[PDB]
Amino acid sequence: WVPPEVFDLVAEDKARCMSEHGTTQAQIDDVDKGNLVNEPSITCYMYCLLEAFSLVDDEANVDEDIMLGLLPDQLQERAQSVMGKCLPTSGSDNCNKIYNLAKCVQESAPDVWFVI
Amino acid sequence: VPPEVFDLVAEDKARCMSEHGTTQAQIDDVDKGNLVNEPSITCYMYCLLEAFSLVDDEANVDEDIMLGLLPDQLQERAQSVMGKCLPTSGSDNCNKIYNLAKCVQESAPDVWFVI
Numbered sequence: 517w518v519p520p521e522v523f524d525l526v527a528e529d530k531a532r533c534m535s536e537h538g539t540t541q542a543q544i545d546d547v548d549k550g551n552l553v554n555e556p557s558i559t560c561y562m563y564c565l566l567e568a569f570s571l572v573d574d575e576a577n578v579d580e581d582i583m584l585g586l587l588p589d590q591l592q593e594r595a596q597s598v599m600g601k602c603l604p605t606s607g608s609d610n611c612n613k614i615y616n617l618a619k620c621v622q623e624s625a626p627d628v629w630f631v632i
Numbered sequence: 633v634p635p636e637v638f639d640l641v642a643e644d645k646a647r648c649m650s651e652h653g654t655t656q657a658q659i660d661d662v663d664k665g666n667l668v669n670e671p672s673i674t675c676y677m678y679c680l681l682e683a684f685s686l687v688d689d690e691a692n693v694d695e696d697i698m699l700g701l702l703p704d705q706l707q708e709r710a711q712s713v714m715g716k717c718l719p720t721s722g723s724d725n726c727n728k729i730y731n732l733a734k735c736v737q738e739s740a741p742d743v744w745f746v747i
């Protein structure tokens with residue numbers, strides 16, 4: 517046995533997603549605080565992070581069951597009502613659909629946000 | 633009032649470790665690629681994969697979800713590893729995941745991916 521090089525999937529996904537969508541760290545910091553803008557460098561970044569855990573496919577379809585598994589116990593009941601209101605996604609393109617979803621979630625549950 | 637921000641991965645690990653009596657030291661060892669066939673840690677590993685929909689209630693791997701964790705450039709290597717290591721086998725869910733982790737480690741020994 518030789519020590520392997522270890523890769524944190526979350527870290528590697530954020531590095532890749534930020535590079536593939538031209539996202540700045542300031543932008544990521546804003547997103548991590550729940551502050552969003554309808555600009556692809558933000559919204560396609562969010563999309564990219566969701567897709568890397570199979571929370572969305574490549575056609576903006578969100579997998580509710582995968583999402584529920586990730587959420588903590590204390591948010592399960594609320595999450596079911598919020599996703600019932602906010603899914604299926606709708607918008608102008610893949611990334612705007614994810615924008616609209618995020619905004620729908622914030623409207624329904626203004627005290628809840630997450631970072632992957 | 634700013635929203636409370638939940639760290640999903642941190643929550644999932646916290647929940648699994650509390651369910652299985654798993655210590656941070658155990659999780660840190662696995663994160664370094666050190667594996668042992670001990671339920672307190674192997675059941676944690678199963679729990680975490682299950683939370684991510686990577687495995688079902690019998691520790692069967694969902695191949696599309698597992699491959700979906702990885703970037704495009706790693707799909708071929710990942711598929712090769714899955715050819716060697718799936719389907720899972722073992723005496724219970726925790727042992728199935730232990731055998732899977734060990735297979736994955738042996739099959740791609742230069743690298744170790746962790747949620």
Ligand SMILES: CC(=O)CCCCC/C=C/C(=O)O
Pocket residue numbers: 561562563565566583595598599602617618621630631632
């Ligand atoms: C429907 C639901 O509960 C959560 C989906 C909201 C989108 C959140 C995106 C988060 C991120 O990209 O960090």
Ligand SMILES: CC(=O)CCCCC/C=C/C(=O)O
Pocket residue numbers: 681686698701702706709710713736740743745746747
């Ligand atoms: C259970 C788990 O953490 C999944 C690890 C990610 C997929 C396995 C990687 C294969 C490869 O990249 O060598």
Ligand SMILES: CC(=O)CCCCC/C=C/C(=O)O
Pocket residue numbers: 645659663677680729730732733734736745746747
């Ligand atoms: C069997 C396999 O492919 C991966 C084993 C589980 C690794 C999951 C990492 C968990 C953590 O980092 O806490």
Ligand SMILES: [Cl-]
Pocket residue numbers: 536537538556557560
């Ligand atoms: Cl983009």
Ligand SMILES: [Cl-]
Pocket residue numbers: 576577578579603604605
């Ligand atoms: Cl959807």
Ligand SMILES: [Cl-]
Pocket residue numbers: 608609610
């Ligand atoms: Cl479209």
Ligand SMILES: [Cl-]
Pocket residue numbers: 691692693694718719720
């Ligand atoms: Cl399997």
Ligand SMILES: [Mg+2]
Pocket residue numbers: 567700
């Ligand atoms: Mg994919």
